[PDB]
Chains A and B, each alone.
Chain A
Amino acid sequence: GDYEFSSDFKEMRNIIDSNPTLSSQDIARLEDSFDRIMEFAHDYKHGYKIITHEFALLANLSLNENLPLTLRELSTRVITSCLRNNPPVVEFINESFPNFKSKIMAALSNLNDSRSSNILIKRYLSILNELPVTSEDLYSTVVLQNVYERNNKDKQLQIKVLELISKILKADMYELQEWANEFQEMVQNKSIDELHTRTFFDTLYNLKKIFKSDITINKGFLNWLAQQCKARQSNLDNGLQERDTEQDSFDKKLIDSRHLIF
């Protein structure tokens, strides 16, 4: 093993191995072990070593519903931090642990059968969004739409649900109206960032390119599309040489969309 964190996980492992039921004092130590190491999980190297050594343990504590939410959140949060911008962790998990996605979605829905709890929901959404979503994994539309609906109070959460729906549609066909309605509402949100704007846009663009009249695009979206057209054409239409290539192409694609798709 060793491994520069063998220590902390040797600890956590026998504390849980010392009693079938963790006492308040046991979970408090586990917690504190989690507080100390959290910061290293973000490290490209450390994050990978941690997942390749401790993932079995991490996933157990995240997914154990008998455990208190704050503790589950802590183990879950180690995973999310190891995953982000960390291709070798993504590949590792999705390959050596192909059932994890499904377990995660299971906990998601059990959480939504409540309470908040919204925090762990979000961590799970974050994980599902970092892992590949393929035709195989086809993830209830009803649970997700339920979580979405239950939480208009939590735009960050809705945003994460809509991100996952973009990925599910992609994996299905190929690469319903209530969802197209959610995307169109959220895409106009002023607090949404450009990368989420694109993702939601593309999903709508594709749906409308594919089903044409069978998907209804609403008036407000069309108004936003017009405002977004002039602003982004005015971006193409200055200097200097520099340019963000990726941004320029997306602008062109959205401007054209009017005369054709929308």
Chain B
Amino acid sequence: NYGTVIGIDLGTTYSCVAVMKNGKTEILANEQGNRITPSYVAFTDDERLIGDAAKNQVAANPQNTIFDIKRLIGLKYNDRSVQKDIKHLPFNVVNKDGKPAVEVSVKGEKKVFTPEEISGMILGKMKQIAEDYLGTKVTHAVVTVPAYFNDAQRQATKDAGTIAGLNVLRIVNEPTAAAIAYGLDKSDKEHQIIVYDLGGGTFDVSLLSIENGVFEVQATSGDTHLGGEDFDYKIVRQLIKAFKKKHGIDVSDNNKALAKLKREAEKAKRALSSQMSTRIEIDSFVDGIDLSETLTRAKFEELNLDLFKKTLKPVEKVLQDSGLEKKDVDDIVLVGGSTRIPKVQQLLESYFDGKKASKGINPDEAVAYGAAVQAGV
């Protein structure tokens, strides 16, 4: 009666869908060939764009394009974090019955959608990726949320599923899913797992216990404004300054210039994960002027050291709170693509006196993978 039930990682910046097929779990690529899908929704006169299509047309439609809705879901309009988060948003957020809701213009009339509905639009796209891949309709899913999410936030996630046409049979904690993806649940004596989850815009760490095969979340800590994008931004800002000093032109307001820069900065960061220095170049960048600049891994790490270091304070807090000593940690699980940054790995390992983190599943896909594993009832 459950059909083929799917696993979905519904992230702040990216979402990912997986399914257990013939006892193997497969991560499923979207219509654009991508295994991970931006958590974006865009409203145009003619279209409701979701995912890749939505994030591509962000530039010239910066206020009908919804992102980071996960920051609002299940929360109250008066909540401190909603107030703070609202400022840094380029789209309109209104109070509807005490809950935050987004207001867009199509057209040119005002339309309002809850965080449940925007989430449901994202979930619907993930479902349809699974339906294209399977031969049929799916009606049930396992969906993941951060471990600190409260009851309101979990119900709102299940409600978003209903709106996508999904019965969410279970809401699973994200750090647990990743632990399951690593088969850390085959204990076999009580184990203490630390999950270190550095996403695109948020940072989570969780101390889990596992005994007999029952997970239990011991502590959580983290930073809602610390992620991969922050590191990229430090490169971008370094580039903007370099170009200004050299040619007198400030590109901070030039959107086309910015779009090109953010993308090259992301390519640079990726290179510095394997090389010690790189060149960043853009032909006809502005006003007939070519951009050409160097970045070393040392400079990149220096730019980001306070940020990289702030990730350890939550690790300690999670040990203090639980009462554990470092030596009592059996497994360190890395979630989120930014965990591939050598300095990030080095700091954590060094913090655990040299012990190796479990990395072997793509860290962007581990959550969805564990979700799909559960969904295999």
Contacts and interface: CB of A to CB of B under 8 A. Distances in A.
B33 A49 contact: yes
Interface residues of A, number: 30
A44 B298 contact: no
Contacts of A4: 32, 52-53, 56
A80 B282 CA distance: 9
Given A193-B294, A247-B298, A45 B283 contact: no
Interface in A49-87: 49, 77, 80-81, 84-86
A122 B177 CA distance: 50
B48 interface: no
Interface in B320-377: none
Contacts of A85: 264, 267-268, 270-271, 278, 280
Contacts of A86: 267
A43 interface: yes
B31 A2 contact: yes
Nearest to A48: B33
A214 interface: no
B281 A84 contact: yes
A95 interface: no
A156 interface: yes
Nearest to B34: A45
Interface of B: 31-34, 52-53, 56, 59, 256, 259-260, 263-264, 266-268, 270-271, 276-284, 290, 292-294, 296-299, 302
A81 B267 CA distance: 11
Interface string A231-262: 00000000000111111000000000000000
Given A2-B31, A84-B267, A85-B270, A243 B281 contact: no
A123 interface: yes
Given A81-B283, A244-B297, 4 more contacts: A4-B52, A84-B264, A85-B280, A126-B283
B264 A42 contact: yes
Contact of B282 (A2, A44, A81, A195): A81
Interface string A165-194: 000000000000000000000000000011
A123 B276 contact: no
Contacts of B256: 39
Interface string A81-125: 100111000000000000000000000000000000000001100
A23 B52 CA distance: 35
Nearest to B275: A246
A247 B279 CA distance: 15
A45 B298 CA distance: 26
A42 B280 CA distance: 11
A157 to B, nearest CB: 11
A19 B253 CA distance: 40
A148 to B, nearest CB: 19
B263 A194 contact: no
A211 interface: no
Contacts of A156: 290, 292
Contact of B298 (A3, A77, A84, A242): A242
A84 B294 CA distance: 13
A244 B295 CA distance: 11
